[PDB]
Design a protein around this ligand. Structure first.
Ligand SMILES: Cc1cc2nc3c(=O)[nH]c(=O)nc-3n(C[C@H](O)[C@H](O)[C@H](O)COP(=O)(O)OP(=O)(O)OC[C@H]3O[C@@H](n4cnc5c(N)ncnc54)[C@H](O)[C@@H]3O)c2cc1C
Ligand SMILES: Cc1cc2nc3c(=O)[nH]c(=O)nc-3n(C[C@H](O)[C@H](O)[C@H](O)COP(=O)(O)OP(=O)(O)OC[C@H]3O[C@@H](n4cnc5c(N)ncnc54)[C@H](O)[C@@H]3O)c2cc1C
Ligand SMILES: O=c1ccn([C@@H]2O[C@H](COP(=O)(O)OP(=O)(O)O)[C@@H](O)[C@H]2O)c(=O)[nH]1
Ligand SMILES: O=c1ccn([C@@H]2O[C@H](COP(=O)(O)OP(=O)(O)O)[C@@H](O)[C@H]2O)c(=O)[nH]1
Ligand SMILES: OC[C@@H](O)[C@H](O)[C@@H](O)CO
Lengths: 365, 364
């Protein structure tokens, strides 16, 4: 009776949205992809700054996956610059590797333990657990309270506004503790940055004539009058349902960007600050991108309880609230929910990509 | 909450973007649309594979004599002062163009003063009764030899027509000088948007009343997007499905290159009237002021096929355009604005003025 219009209206041009727009469009669907922001990319958006330095406006995005499927998929849209991110935490005035490893321990205390001895060292400080439900429990019961306190407690209190004990184990479990001497932030098979940035990658992803891209646009601003047959939604679950069950908490961030007139400011990709400063970490994009430049650009991150949602807050009382919403989302007939914000999952880029690719299969089936 | 738009603007170049900003500031609801995946239309600039700030559709040098236009654009961008300089490759030399005192002195091995090069120009000019073509314009000012060395081959190369087959308004665009002024433009306001056109454009479209749709031909969505008025900045002939035949526009192919050196050319653009397939090379860093270890240049090759860039001004074409101009003047809720829409050889600043004036009309 009324126009059929687009087969899909996708809300959010992040990895979640863009992947599905590419997949759907290649199968011949007509797609409108909208984002409240004036650009594509979601968080992973990158751009050149006032000084001509390629940066990440929303904090550093380092690509990493163990999934051949995901890596070969994204390779359809970008070439790679091999890169393995390394993070140093500022503790006791030293820059020490994080995740904690054999060197972290020897350097901090002045030991000369072997990998074999550090296993035993942990075993002798480890608290015994027992439950193993919280973020405190994962660390403490592997490396004991002193290391927990110097590396995790403060940082976590600062990033989440919550003590490690008030967070699900899944949070701090994301950072392993090692007895070897690996100083890499990630141990995944494929670690590489999109050669020319993420944005270039998104552009190729969204290039299909079957995809129309609409920026500076809340879907609600067009959904009353633009015809569409199905919606893939990728923003926060709560807002889509009017906060009917109340605000699902999402941690946010302020970013302070700065340019310095020197080639290198930091000894590595990111320096973390668990025990000092308003900020949690500083990053220097050139280590990440490989860009040569007479100057250098860095971003300082400030955890904010308010503002654009960036992280779900995994804990039992948020997981309970999310179920209220998951139930509504599932029941919603012509709407598919996918991505970090829309499914309330602490997902990495590769993971969202894999989730979106799984969804596309579901839709096709 | 909203139920549609007041304006559907086809084209996110200067023409449409200016109108979008003015309309929206006056509280109108605006959906701007481009076939391309990016705004800025023709002036769109971006960073290449090497991190050099370039112009994918040919160097765009901003210059205006209009205090009004310049102050308008100033709300959206800061400026890097820059007065573009072109050098023409003639007889194995790099000579200033516009032809000036120094072009003439260095070419012929002369030592004329400014007062003398006027008599020299008068002494070789060919008097034409009435000045009709691009040949007449050049020849009645500097003579048949300079015309040949600097205009004929270049023109034949650029347009695929002799300057004799082109309206006078084409070569008249390039002043002939008795002074030693070596700028391509003598305009009052000469500067580039500090951080590039695209960043300027982004500000321009930033209002909440502006919805931006890319990768989209208007025809794909006009049947189901509610809008009052349409502003169209595409090609006129195409809008009327080519009913009277193709309106001829001239096109361009761009070959971009990056070199491992800080500077490849002695100025921003070198023109080749008499040599090579390309009409010109430009070095972007000259224009943007960017600092960089390497450098990116672009060679422009004239093409008869491709995206429309130039209208071909001449009697048979102005006549074909009147036919289309008629249909557009009839078009009820369509305003035609822009270099393509109105088939005019307009500069960036000139299109900005066209748009501001259209906004004033559209408002009273
Ligand atoms: C600071 C930071 C650093 C990170 N670093 C890494 C890293 O190093 N490695 C890694 O793998 N992952 C990293 N991530 C996570 C990564 O960004 C996510 O996995 C990714 O964002 C998932 O993409 P998405 O599509 O699910 O969500 P998003 O990128 O958040 O996209 C959702 C989009 O939908 C839009 N939207 C929401 N509501 C509406 C609506 N009302 N109307 C229109 N548009 C709407 C939003 O503007 C947003 O752009 C990082 C995240 C942050 C915040
Ligand atoms: C190579 C070159 C160099 C130039 N150098 C200078 C210079 O140095 N100084 C100067 O002042 N001027 C210069 N100009 C002129 C300048 O580019 C134009 O004056 C200016 O772009 C006019 O803006 P516009 O909006 O009218 O046209 P455009 O910028 O061409 O915008 C038209 C847009 O509408 C879109 N469109 C058309 N049809 C449709 C449709 N069917 N559906 C959706 N979208 C559509 C097109 O994709 C295009 O992006 C140059 C032009 C060229 C080609
Ligand atoms: O130096 C650190 C880094 C990690 N974390 C904890 O580990 C969690 C996961 O951090 P990760 O870097 O894996 O996720 P990200 O914050 O980068 O998105 C953090 O939120 C912190 O609670 C920490 O305590 N100290
Ligand atoms: O070196 C030059 C520069 C310009 N022109 C003629 O002048 C016109 C105006 O060129 P512009 O650079 O102003 O655009 C061109 O199309 C040419 O026909 C020329 O013959 N030689
Ligand atoms: O005003 C003098 C110069 O022309 C400048 O524009 C500099 O080159 C800036 O980079």
């Amino acid at each position: 009776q009324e126009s059929k219009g687009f087969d899909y209206l996708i809300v959010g041009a992040g990895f979640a949205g863009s992947v599905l727009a590419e997949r759907l469009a290649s199968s011949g669907q007509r797609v409108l992809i909208v984002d409240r922001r004036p650009h594509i990319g979601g968080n992973a958006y990158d751009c050149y700054d006032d000084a001509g330095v390629l940066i990440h406006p929303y904090g550093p995005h380092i690509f990493h996956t163990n999934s051949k499927d995901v890596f070969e998929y994204l390779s359809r849209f970008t070439e790679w610059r091999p890169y393995q991110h390394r993070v140093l935490a500022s503790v006791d005035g030293q820059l020490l590797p994080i995740p904690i490893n054999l060197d972290t321990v020897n350097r901090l205390y002045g030991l000369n333990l072997t990998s074999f001895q550090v296993e035993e060292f942990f075993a002798s400080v480890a608290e015994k657990v027992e439950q193993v439900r919280t973020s405190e429990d994962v660390v403490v019961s592997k490396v004991g309270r002193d290391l927990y306190n110097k590396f995790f407690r403060g940082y976590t209190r600062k990033q989440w506004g919550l003590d490690p004990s008030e967070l699900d184990a899944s949070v701090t479990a994301r950072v392993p503790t090692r007895t070897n001497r690996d100083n890499r932030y990630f141990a995944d098979t494929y670690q590489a940055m999109p050669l020319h940035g993420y944005t270039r990658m998104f552009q190729n992803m969204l290039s299909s004539p079957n995809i129309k891209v609409m920026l500076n646009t809340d879907y609600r601003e067009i959904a009353d009058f633009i015809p569409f047959q199905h919606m893939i939604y990728t923003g926060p679950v709560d807002a889509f349902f009017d906060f009917c069950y109340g605000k699902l908490p999402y941690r946010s961030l302020e970013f302070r960007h700065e340019t310095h007139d020197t080639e290198q400011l930091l000894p590595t990709g990111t320096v973390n600050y668990p025990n000092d400063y308003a900020y949690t970490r500083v990053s220097e994009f050139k280590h990440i991108t490989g860009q040569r430049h007479h100057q250098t650009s860095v971003v300082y991150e400030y955890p904010r309880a308010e503002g654009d949602p960036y992280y779900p807050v995994p804990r039992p009382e948020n997981a309970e609230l999310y179920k209220k919403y998951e139930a509504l989302a599932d029941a919603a007939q012509d709407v598919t929910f996918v991505g970090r914000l829309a499914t309330y999952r602490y997902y990495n880029m590769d993971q969202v990509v894999a989730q979106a690719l799984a969804t596309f299969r579901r839709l096709q089936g």
